[PDB]
Design a protein around this ligand. Sequence first.
Ligand SMILES: CCCCCCCCCC(=O)OC[C@H]1O[C@@](CO)(O[C@H]2O[C@@H](OC)[C@@H](O)[C@H](O)[C@@H]2O)[C@@H](O)[C@@H]1O
Ligand SMILES: O=C(O)CCC(=O)C(=O)O
Ligand SMILES: [Cl-]
Ligand SMILES: [Cl-]
Ligand SMILES: [Fe+2]
Length: 304
Amino acid sequence: KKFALTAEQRASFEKNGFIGPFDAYSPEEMKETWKRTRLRLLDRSAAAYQDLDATNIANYDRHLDDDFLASHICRPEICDRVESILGPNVLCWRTEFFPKYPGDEGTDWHQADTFANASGKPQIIWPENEEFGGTITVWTAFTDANIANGCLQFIPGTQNSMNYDETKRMTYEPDANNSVVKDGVRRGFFGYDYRQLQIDENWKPDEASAVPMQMKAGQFIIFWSTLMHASYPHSGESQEMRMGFASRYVPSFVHVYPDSDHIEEYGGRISLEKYGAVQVIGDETPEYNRLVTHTTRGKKFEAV
Ligand SMILES: CCCCCCCCCC(=O)OC[C@H]1O[C@@](CO)(O[C@H]2O[C@@H](OC)[C@@H](O)[C@H](O)[C@@H]2O)[C@@H](O)[C@@H]1O
Ligand SMILES: O=C(O)CCC(=O)C(=O)O
Ligand SMILES: [Cl-]
Ligand SMILES: [Cl-]
Ligand SMILES: [Fe+2]
């Protein structure tokens, strides 16, 4: 395909667990798009999740209602590269906005395989006979992302061994988890402390090996959710907020929300009644995954 990963890019992705950044839009197109989208998103009247019983879940799955986001998750610049990794049939199962307002704590070091981390119940399940896990995250910079405003950071090559156990639980306590200093950096996990999920209580992330991923508005980075990743704090030197938009992809054989019609996490609870995965690549998905083809405003999931 036109935007497939090169053989060299594919080898680097296999080694590092991330690849990019790549361009989806020019910075100028992204700036104007985000200006409009940010306003539009304040209107939740068509959102898949009406009652939030509150929560970070408010940031979830706005592609299910929003015209632009519906196109974005299907961009060939993104999908051709995800296809290079995940094969001929792929679903977008989750999107999430990640704001860092001026002064916000950095995101905790974490890895996620099943996405039971917060809820205690797996959200994606790969074939049990195999050794694969996690989801391909595409994180798009809707604003510029630099160290001072809380860009992502990665510890390269850590995607093949989990340091966290998502069957352990972590307590939701926003009150307590506000800019807690961890190894000299203010960090948290949206009201949780991801250190609670460590397999070994005394183990620490190899933060000395962390690398920054600075990006311009309109770029995206592709990484395994099983990769050690985090963000710097937003120092507030800039009075502009940072916004990332994560779209999460799995091959269509992965079980999405097995045995669930609701999820409860991040201080909220939502019904999956209007949820579906979106088939962004290919046209075969097993019956056990509920799909949607259009947004709640009847916009088809296709790149425009
Ligand atoms: C027709 C084409 C179909 C293609 C389907 C997509 C298959 C993706 C396979 C993969 O690379 O999975 C890698 C994920 O599994 C992980 C989980 O730790 O790796 C495991 O897979 C192996 O890759 C062969 C090993 O290298 C690692 O030890 C690892 O445990 C991480 O690299 C990722 O989260
Ligand atoms: O943007 C952030 O601070 C965290 C992003 C993240 O953890 C993810 O995309 O999985
Ligand atoms: Cl590490
Ligand atoms: Cl994650
Ligand atoms: Fe993450």
